[PDB]
Symmetry: C7
Subunit: 29 residues, 7 copies
């Protein structure tokens, strides 16, 4: 369904934030 | 539907946050 | 509808977080 | 409705995060 | 309702993130 | 219900992010 | 249900942000 597919896009975006934040920790190290 | 469209709007805004957070990592690199 | 309208405010608030985070990246760049 | 009201409360909390994050940018610029 | 109650805990958790992020801005000033 | 428990799961994860973010502030001091 | 599963995927992605942010605090220390 359209609602469940949108919620899965929100999850994917949050995983991209996690990856971006791991780039920061790398950058600090 | 209106609800699905608004949730996809939320996903897009979270992709904007991901891009901004990566620029923070790159500014610490430079 | 009231639920869709509130979801679109959530998206707008996330866009404001992205803007703030972009401001950080600029401040780090100096 | 109680769901819409709770979603608006989420949006307000996200606006608080945006203000906090901008203050991090202001504290880096000093 | 159980859904609205859960959404209000989401909002409360987000206000805790804002508070944590305001602590960061204070640590940077220091 | 399954939806409400999942939303409570989201709130707890956000409480983990608040703790982590505060640790970042503690590591600056 | 598909909606509850997608909400649980959102919670898992937020836990992945928390882990990133905990790592970021260790990299500052």
């Amino acid at each position: 369904g359209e609602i469940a597919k949108a919620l899965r896009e929100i999850a994917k975006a949050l995983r991209e934030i996690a990856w971006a934040n791991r780039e920061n920790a790398k950058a600090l190290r």
